Design a protein around this ligand. Structure first.
Ligand SMILES: O=C(NCCCc1ccccc1)N[C@H]1CC[C@@H](OCc2c(F)cccc2F)CC1
Length: 336
């Protein structure tokens, strides 16, 4: 089997939709090489899509896993509901639970992996559906505790806290949604998001201010995508109805809804506890989610394996072969 990364419209995989908890969910499906060991569900983040797992999908197939990688709510061929409650980590976990079981049966179990927002999702999914999740890993995103209260992020960063998250203020607002419409702007956006720079090294995106709209005109080719990959992100994001970024930016509009779900769990729900084998792959140059952010996380796991790869936030691609080996070796030991 060819184990190189997926190309746009790779024929080694299938592209399908299913109705999931009221929404059309599009996904990549890769069938295993050899008798199926497990089904693996892979969850991307922002501003990515299923194709962001392009290094992991053929690899996991070659290891004997069936691989389901959805375009998550708001992204590409998956529906983008208007109701923000559809975008909470709890509802999205329920989405993943139903999609998972639509392949493994209701009595089935999966391996579950996540990155960025997807990492946050899979920890919550492993918390809300421990019957389903046999093993869970996250790249870049560490566990965060059950929210015990709600504070607006404005007031949080105004006090000087969570400064590495202040970009999310712009994202939840109207500026990115209103400005990044159509393929021309989306192309610039993606050059910015995947590391392209301007004639004086101007960054198109920063964790402080978000998208630097004034830079997008001079933004050069991104180092972390090739030209056809870039076009593929543009084409697929274009599947959303204008404003195309509404769905993806909805992930930054649920702080209070998520806080309300989880304050309920902090009060009455079971403890945030993970009994199944778990893997956290840190990224050294991820300035949105620096490795130090995971300090103290191990106390919530019976069985947490830690790794760390030298890469930016985009570790699935930049360090794809290393990430692959880390997942493969951990899975080989987790499941035995
Ligand atoms: O939005 C995200 N990434 C956007 C792209 C970042 C980037 C950097 C450089 C170049 C391109 C892109 N990530 C989400 C991941 C899940 C969320 O986790 C919730 C959460 C907490 F509330 C508190 C503590 C930890 C914790 F995970 C937090 C932001």
């Amino acid at each position: 089997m060819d184990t190189s990364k997926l190309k746009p419209n790779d024929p080694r995989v299938k592209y399908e939709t299913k109705q999931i908890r009221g929404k059309t969910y599009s996904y990549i499906l890769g069938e295993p090489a050899g008798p199926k060991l497990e089904t693996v569900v892979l969850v991307h983040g922002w501003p990515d899509m299923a194709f962001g797992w392009r290094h992991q999908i053929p690899y996991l197939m070659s290891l004997g896993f069936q691989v389901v990688a959805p375009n998550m709510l708001g992204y590409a061929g998956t529906d983008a509901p208007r109701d923000l409650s559809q975008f909470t980590l709890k509802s999205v976990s329920a989405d993943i639970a139903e999609l998972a079981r639509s392949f493994v049966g209701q009595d089935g179990q999966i391996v579950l992996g996540g990155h960025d927002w997807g990492g946050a999702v899979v920890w919550r999914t492993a918390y809300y559906h421990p019957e389903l999740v046999k093993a869970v890993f996250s790249v870049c995103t560490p566990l965060h505790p059950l929210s015990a209260e709600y504070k607006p992020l404005e007031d949080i960063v105004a006090a000087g806290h969570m400064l590495n998250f202040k970009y999310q203020l712009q994202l939840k607002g109207p500026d990115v949604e209103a400005r990044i419409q159509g393929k021309d702007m989306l192309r610039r956006f993606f050059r910015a998001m995947f590391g392209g720079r301007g004639p004086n090294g101007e960054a198109g995106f920063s964790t402080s201010d978000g998208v630097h709209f004034d830079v997008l005109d001079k933004i050069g080719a991104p180092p972390l995508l090739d030209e056809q990959e870039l076009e593929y992100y543009v084409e697929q994001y274009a599947l959303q109805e204008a404003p195309e970024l509404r769905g993806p930016l909805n992930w930054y509009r649920t702080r209070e809804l998520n806080a309300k779900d989880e304050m309920d769990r902090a009060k009455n729900g079971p403890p945030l506890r993970f009994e199944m084998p778990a893997l956290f792959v840190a990224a050294s140059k991820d300035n949105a989610l620096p490795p130090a952010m995971s300090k103290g996380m191990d106390a919530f796991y019976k069985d947490l394996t830690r790794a760390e790869v030298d890469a930016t936030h985009w570790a699935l691609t930049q360090a794809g072969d290393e990430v692959n080996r880390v997942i493969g070796e951990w899975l080989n030991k987790a499941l035995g």
